[PDB]
Amino acid sequence: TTALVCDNGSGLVKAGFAGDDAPRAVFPSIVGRPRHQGVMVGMGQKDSYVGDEAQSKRGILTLKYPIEHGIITNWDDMEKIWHHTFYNELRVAPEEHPTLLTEAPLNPKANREKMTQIMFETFNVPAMYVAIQAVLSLYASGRTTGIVLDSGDGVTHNVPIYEGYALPHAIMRLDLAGRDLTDYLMKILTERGYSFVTTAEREIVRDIKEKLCYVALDFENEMATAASSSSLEKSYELPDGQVITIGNERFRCPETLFQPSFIGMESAGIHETTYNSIMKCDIDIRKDLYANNVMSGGTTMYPGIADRMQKEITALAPSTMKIKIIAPPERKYSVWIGGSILASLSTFQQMWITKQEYDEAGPSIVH
């Protein structure tokens, strides 16, 4: 009976049937072929390992994410992600359920077409809808107004929505975050002698990007107080027994979202893309875009937000204009809890793309 909410994550693909609580399967999507030769004999090994098992068996493979700058690198690896996930994890045939797939708000054509078209001929799905990850985060956050932040490794976005229509004249896409924040963290832990120069080993850095790093309330005074003797430096333990001590760089790295000067990229900070998109909308609507700023994605689970983001907007904003920042619990699953509301709803069952209608009509139905 029940439809399937399947999110084509930036990271971090999410899959689970429609409702009730939290996604059944979440996984990092990586494929890695084995660079070394086998001597055990058979061969008795897979040609390319998918995740979870390619994150439990690293350093004998060369890890390659299938989605690069929000577009699929080849559908040869992507279809294999799908096949592996549906059959030997979830244990489901795509012909059983009408499905729900996701894409990015601003993304190259024919990425949604090629996806929809290949997935219909390969997996033989009976009906489909393709939703942007940001729109679904509104329903998950219980509202229909606000600027939506879907921020993942490696594409963040800033989309303004007002009850209950989309404003096309103020849409911002940043490619600044988040895999370049990962790559930058790997360059400044290499700066303190913790070498992580290879593709697979970079994943351990990404896990240290989660837990240790935080957002400073005030940069200049945290830089002062870092020079002070009392420790802001934390000692991490590594799988080979090593002890890694990071401190100054610890609050510097997330600050990059406000300060792109750390990367050396000209692209405007989240501070300014938020402000500059609100102040590109019509005058009357600006009133209700303030205090409906809605965050999403796993990358917004840092300490120090939302009151850094709040204070920075409140500092640039007009007098006695109040900003509240809408932060859902467990933002990494926001999009999926969104998707569940959409594909379950009546009467929008007939705004899906069904296989019979699609055969005559072609991919013109998608857009």
Partner: protein
């Protein structure tokens, strides 16, 4: 489903093997027979997994099933050999307790690797049963 039936039979034998390896010198013949019985069940899983792979309608699932099941012969053969070694150490004229303990740990580890390969074979067999 005879792969699942064989896998559950193997799990019950592995529960008995768990009880036997915690015993003293009195579990010697039972331990060797248990390993022989586990190896017989693993050969049945391998034979059935190749037959299910033949009846499957997609090359990829068939290839993955053949990849995982082909390690079962080598690991089950190592279990039979390592059981002969452990047999010749039990009741031996001069033998160390540390060496006996390490042989038991190796035998349990090899059984765990066989069980893990069979667990993955079950996952691919379930997936093969879709097509």
């Amino acid at each position: 489903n005879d792969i699942i039936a064989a896998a559950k039979r193997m799990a019950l034998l592995m529960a008995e093997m768990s009880r036997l390896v915690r015993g003293g010198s009195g579990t010697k013949r039972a331990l060797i027979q248990c390993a022989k019985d586990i190896a017989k069940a693993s050969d049945e899983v391998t034979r059935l997994a190749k037959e299910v792979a033949k009846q499957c309608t997609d090359k990829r699932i068939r290839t993955n099933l053949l990849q995982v099941c082909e390690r079962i012969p080598t690991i089950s053969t190592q279990l039979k050999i390592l059981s002969t070694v452990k047999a010749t150490m039990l009741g031996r004229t001069n033998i160390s307790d540390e060496e006996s303990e390490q042989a038991t740990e190796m035998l349990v580890h090899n059984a765990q690797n066989l069980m893990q390969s069979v667990k993955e074979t079950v996952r691919e067999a379930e997936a093969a049963s879709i097509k």
